[PDB]
Amino acid sequence: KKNVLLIVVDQWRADFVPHVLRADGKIDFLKTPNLDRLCREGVTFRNHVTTCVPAGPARASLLTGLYLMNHRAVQNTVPLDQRHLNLGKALRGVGYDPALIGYTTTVPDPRTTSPNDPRFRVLGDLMDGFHPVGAFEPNMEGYFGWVAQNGFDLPEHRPDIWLPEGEDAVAGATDRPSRIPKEFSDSTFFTERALTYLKGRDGKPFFLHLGYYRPHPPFVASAPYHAMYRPEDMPAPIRAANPDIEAAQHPLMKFYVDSIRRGSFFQGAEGSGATLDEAELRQMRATYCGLITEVDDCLGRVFSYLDETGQWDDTLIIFTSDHGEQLGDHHLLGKIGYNDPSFRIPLVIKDAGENARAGAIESGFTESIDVMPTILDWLGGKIPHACDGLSLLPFLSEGRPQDWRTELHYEYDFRDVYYSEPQSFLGLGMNDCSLCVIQDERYKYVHFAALPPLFFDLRHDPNEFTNLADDPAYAALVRDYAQKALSWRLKHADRTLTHYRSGPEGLSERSH
Amino acid sequence: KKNVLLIVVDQWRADFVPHVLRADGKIDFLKTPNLDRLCREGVTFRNHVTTCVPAGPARASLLTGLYLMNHRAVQNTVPLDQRHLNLGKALRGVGYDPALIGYTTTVPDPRTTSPNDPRFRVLGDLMDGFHPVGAFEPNMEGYFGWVAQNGFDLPEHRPDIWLPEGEDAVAGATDRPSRIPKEFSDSTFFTERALTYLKGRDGKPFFLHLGYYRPHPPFVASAPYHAMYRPEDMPAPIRAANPDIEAAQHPLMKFYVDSIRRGSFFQGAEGSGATLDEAELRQMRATYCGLITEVDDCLGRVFSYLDETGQWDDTLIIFTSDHGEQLGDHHLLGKIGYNDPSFRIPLVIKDAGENARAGAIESGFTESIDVMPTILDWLGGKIPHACDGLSLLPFLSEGRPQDWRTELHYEYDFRDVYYSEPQSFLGLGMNDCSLCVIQDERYKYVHFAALPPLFFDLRHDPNEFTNLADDPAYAALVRDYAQKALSWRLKHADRTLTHYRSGPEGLSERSH
């Protein structure tokens, strides 16, 4: 029997993974024993990125194996064209039910449904082709209904469960717990749906997309996770001397430093994200770690059910996140722009049985578009022609293929959406608001469609403070990275029908 | 605010509706106080039929507003063509989320999915376009997973929860309870999903398809519903002197009398349905009533939540069943053939506010294809051109329209499916295995595509024992009913594009 458990957390940074911290001799300032078990038993990928942000685009790439340049779900609220083959439909093609807990943040294709469809009122709904067994639902109604049915009285504005405890509490980074008990938290909800689904399967082969919302904000935690980590034990945020000096690097950086609000990160909070002080940012980081450890506790319950039913060694387990989180770096909160912390994400894979590379940490450059090909390959399917990504299965046996990619790539599109509208400030039209990034161990190149490019020397400037793109001494290097990025564009043009050929013998297909 | 609650039970007969029994001066031998409330407050339709059986075809007609002659989902296991507009997609067209609890028994269109799709392994899965919030799931996994997560230990073969209590129990009609407590029954499950969904909506407008499996078999009930009704208080089954005399009426009757097995109606039971004695049939009927009263108790919890939140007077409530049940009549169990008890079904409608016809019983002839037009009309939508049915809203105000139909119509297709294969016995090919029925207060005509027809005088022979179709004295009457049925066929040919016209002014549409 073969099972696949795809765990997708939200907003969890790659540098909040204890197995990698310890390997580098750093203090592992947070506890994730269940993730650590996956790392001891499988392969941890230390240079994994999402190919775009925020949730809607990231999940389009994860669930189609396509770059943003091909899926075109370029921002939250922008439709996903129905033509793209997604993981749910591909799973049905190999005889698996594509069971899903959590959310996909997918706007339907308007050519397929009425313009009055309620799914157009929200950031996104479930992607067509999945079988929902534990949906957060539009406006988190699935979760709130479950809390209410469990007998907990909700406030009139339901997200006020995430105000800090106590009528005198000041909204923002907090040392207080939220107003929801642990047993009715959202992580508990998704976990109960996972256990219900696995118990219903009763040993039969499964695919399950187990989505967790946490550690997505609001950065407030149920007791006692709110108090589990001391602010002084957290890694310091990395940022310029002040927000103006930070913003001077690039107009897009200035837009986000100026515009991001605390209320998007802490329920009811007022003021700008960029003005948080070091103590507030350390408290935010401690609460973020508490939310992470709650998820890890919950995963322990899922893993316990797999152990008790004898299914652990039959299950391919993939742990990843949709995207990262700035967490105060560069004066930013959220998943925006071009910096490493928004795009670097965990990826740990435990094969069935005793893993040949158990415990290894892989530096090969991997991208979220590789996850769908990996799952389909493992289940014996053909990888769709159109996918941009490649199967990671060679990394679980002999290691990095000799012809594997030598750069990481990602994209970001910042055209206007209802809650964030940079076009007027930037002076740009909607089809000119994008960037792409190419990077390796030494250099990082950020190319904007219609704004200045950026170039960083990562050995000397690992935190991306010193743009070199306009320095004439770097002209040959900038040329080289722009050339690699341009080749990458040409190599990833759409592949839907390009293997077919007419000819004297009729219709044929080219394989190489 | 406008809400719609569409309650769809399964396998509940029209003559098991106490409000109608009492109106006719009959003993109301079962208790349904919550349904009785709907009847006191709304309109009870006493001549409602499903336009086909069993579940898959019945639910295709209910959820598309089309006769079987147009939807072509002619038996369980036969695909529903994606071209037909269903109620879920139509609801999205009026801005409603098409939330659904229970099941639709819909086989996907093979042109839309892989032939390996797991949805082709089961009798049917969820119809495309609905939003599931409480699915029974393939093989009832949703229910069983919920029972297991509630801490109840299930037997190795999970349907053995429906064996009668006690290792010494004989499977079949029983005076013992099932092996599942009331608090973990399937009716409790669907009810908890309904409460969870309504609590999540928190007062916002809703559509909810609230499906119950009961009183579908196995005919066994959780305590104390198994003992709630005395067998001697049940209405007697109506059947011929013996199964051979019954079967002589028609080859299709013979096929079902010979083939139907007790194990399809009582978990683990052996033997033929037709050999049940009168006492066994009375016990079966008493258990069936117990399952009905459990559903009614559950509806009381849903109605209580609507009352407490002040939504009752804002909600159009429609109560109906997918189809009926022979329940021993004519030596048959199940929903098959051509007799009234398989096709007659409850229908009660309570409008928002104080209903103009509260308490009335309507004799106008209504069909399940009318339900979707009624809901869309009530929500301010246009009724799709293709629907065969008509809105029932006039019946809630002034009464039966002057041009309403004057006959009831239904269809049955009995081509081979994996668990019932009459073609060899009947000597028929797959496209020749159907019948249609037309009837009014006086006469009933059953026309087979490729077997003898039947004709009944319902005043003198209300129970359909005496075929008159081959009696020369009835030639003019049989002619007349065949002519009405043939006109009905011509009038209901597909209407997808037939209102459009080319012409000198370009494309236009005819409205009359």
Add this chain to the structure above:
Amino acid sequence: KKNVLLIVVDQWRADFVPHVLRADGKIDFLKTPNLDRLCREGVTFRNHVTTCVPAGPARASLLTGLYLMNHRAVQNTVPLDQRHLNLGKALRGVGYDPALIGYTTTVPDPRTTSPNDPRFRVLGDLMDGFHPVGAFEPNMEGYFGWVAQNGFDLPEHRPDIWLPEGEDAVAGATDRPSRIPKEFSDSTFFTERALTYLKGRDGKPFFLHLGYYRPHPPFVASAPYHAMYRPEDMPAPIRAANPDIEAAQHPLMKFYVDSIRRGSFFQGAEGSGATLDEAELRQMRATYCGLITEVDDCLGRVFSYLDETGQWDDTLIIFTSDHGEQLGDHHLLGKIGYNDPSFRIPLVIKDAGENARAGAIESGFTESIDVMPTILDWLGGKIPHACDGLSLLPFLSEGRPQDWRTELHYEYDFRDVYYSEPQSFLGLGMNDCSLCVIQDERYKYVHFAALPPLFFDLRHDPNEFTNLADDPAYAALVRDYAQKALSWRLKHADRTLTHYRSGPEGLSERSH
């Protein structure tokens, strides 16, 4: 090598086929030596009907193998749903180019094109899936452009080429030629396109739909075909004592007797069709024969090219018409209503090589829906599941199959179109304006959806003057024919997906 030549004339009656006239000892009052060659070498089907009229519906049935009840292109100007598989697409499935000369009169599906498409300004355009090599074109522009490019000066209103020669001519039935020379006639045009296409093929396998407009009206002929037949040698029209007595038979008969205009049949003519006298009708018939003989002369040129290139014995030749013509019978002109002369059509089939039944006349009942299955069968294709018709190939070898149909069937829908609007006169809505016909050697039954039925004893009343449907002495016979027609409806419900099945082994198909 295998070729198919499908010759489709327009408006040519089955009783204008000399081989059948001579077989019955009647005078063959018109000459068709080239058709007579096909009859001597192949099989002539004497009981062939189109399953509906006029051109648009007839050609939908011919080119899909479907009854009107399934294709739903129910009148000229009504769209053909793109879902139906047509002969052109099916030919591509067997590797044949679906070359077409003439027209198909097909209104596009509005869901597939802009509402501004010029194809919605005309009665119909080319059916999707064919390869046009000689289109009449919208408004006959293809023909008129060819005449103009040939150097012939056209009048300002181009159809005035069909006024009778001479400024003093009275428009109507005429003993004068038209104003177009034979070398620039429409039959010459289609023939030149056929020769161009066959010469381009240069011996390679072909399918060609060779459409002729003639003998469709206006009933005027190029010299000397206008004078080739004497009016006194024509068969007399068959009609009641006067138009009022004719019209009394049925409201639909009255509508057409009252409404049909001479201008629809003779260019520029005034007055009603029903008031033509016997001499005028005989002249009309003589001109109609002249147009037929012109087509036959043209076919001789096509056949000569096949003989000279050695392809005759490699070619399946099918000669047929889209529909018939009343030609004055029952006071009617055109192709309307329910009488035999509108629906009976020629069908002659010459197989490749020496035909086993060369010269035979077949009385088995054949329908235009059989033609597409016949062609696909002959080319080695599978007949589409959805077709209503059956292959005629058994008739070319051993003869009529033992299980062949025992009645002929056809349909007519008379809902309002821009140039003929009977609904107000009849008092009917658009979905109630149809009839179906079932008949055999003895009896004919015409069933209207919402008007009185008709029944004829064809031995005693071969010309359909005496309705018997309301005579009580015929009640059992009328019953029997209504029952056969109702069975036919049930047997021909749509078959798109009804062979598929879900089940424990996955998706399967039933073959019987």
Add this chain to the structure above:
Amino acid sequence: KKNVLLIVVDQWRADFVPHVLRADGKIDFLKTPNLDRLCREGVTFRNHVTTCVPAGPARASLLTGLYLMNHRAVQNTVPLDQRHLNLGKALRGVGYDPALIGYTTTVPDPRTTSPNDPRFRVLGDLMDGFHPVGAFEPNMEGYFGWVAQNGFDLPEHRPDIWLPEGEDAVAGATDRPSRIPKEFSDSTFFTERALTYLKGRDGKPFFLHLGYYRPHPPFVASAPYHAMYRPEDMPAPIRAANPDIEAAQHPLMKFYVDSIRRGSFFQGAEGSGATLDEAELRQMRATYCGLITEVDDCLGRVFSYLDETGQWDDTLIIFTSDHGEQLGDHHLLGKIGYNDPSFRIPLVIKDAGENARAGAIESGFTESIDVMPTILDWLGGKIPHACDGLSLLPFLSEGRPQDWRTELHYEYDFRDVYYSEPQSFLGLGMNDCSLCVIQDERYKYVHFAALPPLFFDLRHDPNEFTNLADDPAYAALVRDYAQKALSWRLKHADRTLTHYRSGPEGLSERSH
């Protein structure tokens, strides 16, 4: 009234346009009086390119307004995805019939038709959505059938009409005429179809795509066009000292210098294209001019019909070519690679009425993707969101828009097709065989996906002999052009749905 005549020749170079030659003080060594009339009356665009080559890709860009990066019909024999909106369907959206003479070289989408479709046996067939009124047809059957029907006896192998006259003739560049008289030439054929179509329209508004095959090879002409130009009066080919020195520039150049055969350019010829001597190339150029003048003579007949019917001043006339021709430059024949002569093409536009810029020559950079937007704009349509091109109408009134593009762009994909397979020689996989080009008045940058780039200084090296891309002194310039090309990629990602947005008010669209 508004008409559009879109004249599309094949393989005609931009530097074979006399109006531009004379403007630059060069000898106009060929005569095109009818094209010269369009130039005197309209605007001549001197920096127009096709965005890709050869015919199939070029015509996909012309007829969709999309770059190859979006249409993906990347080589002849590769399907065009049906999702792209083409000019024919867009014309129907504005009420115009999309009449077409010539060919489009379009391989159908395999998801829309049988794999056995004969359209998969040829390089391409007609694009879906056009109305053919003069097709060359598969294998030029339309033309050959027309020649045969005109009474001209064709040789057994029909293309042998293009052998030079006389049994002793040596195949290759020739001073002899072909074996087809002028009155039966292919240019005469397309012209007769144009006149037939316009005469059929009889003054009604038209769109006509008037395609000519010439001056596509074989480079042989009907008498007396074969002798109209002296070889010594032709411009000399521009090429390196020998083929080896030429080929050293780049592996793709070497592939084509080594592989191109004379038989692809002269009927029956043997040997390599690269070994033609200067005299042979001058004769080839003189014959090429003869074919051009034959097309111009033919256009004079079309223009004469427009003048005589008073339609000239009501007609937007656009003259262009699908692509250019190397004509011996760089040792190459055909339309391949990256050099200017393969991609630069004529474009002349005459507006209705007296043109504001009559006679002007425009240096603004225009691309073939601009043609479809121009036509739709002129007819009052909306330009489809997805188009990459922009309307040229501002150039006919006030001139180049201030925000017009500042570089020309084109693409070439050289993955294996049945008659040319460079992948093995180049060592590349199928998705790595492309290049893109960006250029302006000063510099040209050729970027290969997986081979070395090229960079040319066009003032000092107008003929592209001296690659500078690997010269360190050019690093900043190469950087700049790679950056412009990378921005162009980002700006032209697919736009199908990217203007739509979900949000609190429902579905909306962004316009800027």
